[PDB]
Design an enzyme around this catalytic site. Sequence first.
Site, PDB file in Angstrom:
ATOM      1  N   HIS A  12       0.769  -1.260   0.000  1.00 45.30           N
ATOM      2  CA  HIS A  12       0.000   0.000   0.000  1.00 45.30           C
ATOM      3  C   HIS A  12       0.789   1.293   0.000  1.00 45.30           C
ATOM      4  CE1 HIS A  12      -3.550  -2.398   0.409  1.00 45.30           C
ATOM      5  NE2 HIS A  12      -3.041  -2.980   1.482  1.00 45.30           N
ATOM      6  N   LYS A  41      -4.215 -10.085  -7.559  1.00 45.22           N
ATOM      7  CA  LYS A  41      -4.935  -9.418  -6.468  1.00 45.22           C
ATOM      8  C   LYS A  41      -6.012  -8.548  -7.133  1.00 45.22           C
ATOM      9  CE  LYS A  41      -4.167  -7.001  -2.056  1.00 45.22           C
ATOM     10  NZ  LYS A  41      -4.882  -5.692  -2.035  1.00 45.22           N
ATOM     11  N   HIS A 119      -3.309  -2.917   7.985  1.00 45.51           N
ATOM     12  CA  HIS A 119      -4.393  -3.252   7.064  1.00 45.51           C
ATOM     13  C   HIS A 119      -4.922  -1.959   6.467  1.00 45.51           C
ATOM     14  CE1 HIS A 119      -8.439  -4.702   5.791  1.00 45.51           C
ATOM     15  NE2 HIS A 119      -8.928  -3.761   6.579  1.00 45.51           N
ATOM     16  N   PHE A 120      -5.096  -1.956   5.149  1.00 41.22           N
ATOM     17  CA  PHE A 120      -5.763  -0.847   4.502  1.00 41.22           C
ATOM     18  C   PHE A 120      -7.255  -1.169   4.448  1.00 41.22           C
ATOM     19  CE2 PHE A 120      -5.200   3.069   2.214  1.00 41.22           C
ATOM     20  CZ  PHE A 120      -6.409   3.202   1.557  1.00 41.22           C
TER      21      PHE A 120
HETATM   22 CL   LIG Z   1      -4.174  -4.515   3.864  1.00 45.83          CL
END
Ligand SMILES: [Cl-]
Length: 128
Positions: A12, A41, A119-120
């Site tokens: 990210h 992904k 985590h996004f």
């Molecule tokens: Cl993530």
Amino acid sequence: KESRAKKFQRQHMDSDSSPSSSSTYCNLMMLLRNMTQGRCKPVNTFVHEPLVDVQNVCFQEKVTCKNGQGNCYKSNSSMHITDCRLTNGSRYPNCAYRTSPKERHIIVACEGSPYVPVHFDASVEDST
Ligand SMILES: [Cl-]
Ligand SMILES: [Cl-]
Ligand SMILES: [Cl-]
Ligand SMILES: [Cl-]
Ligand SMILES: [Cl-]
Ligand SMILES: [Cl-]
């Protein structure tokens, strides 16, 4: 071998590139960041800001995670991001992406010591 914090950075963070991603940015970046190994992904967001600025989000506004659990935080400021979405016609190992640059508040889940993004969770346009 990868910690959640390192996985977050790999997937990210893109601190050193221009915010106005060209149409091929996601094709190149999803490959370079190992997100087309084994499978394509389907969706991914990159953040074009300094690492320290993203890490500091862990100390900004606490908000509910999309799944109602974990500790999530929304950035005070709108950040440069790029959304990447796997094209309809794509199938592994051919992974093509549409690139969508935008400016959005980011929402990340944070954990550990140091307390860092792992985590996004989401991005949103509206402040507060
Ligand atoms: Cl993530
Ligand atoms: Cl900015
Ligand atoms: Cl779309
Ligand atoms: Cl999008
Ligand atoms: Cl939005
Ligand atoms: Cl939306």
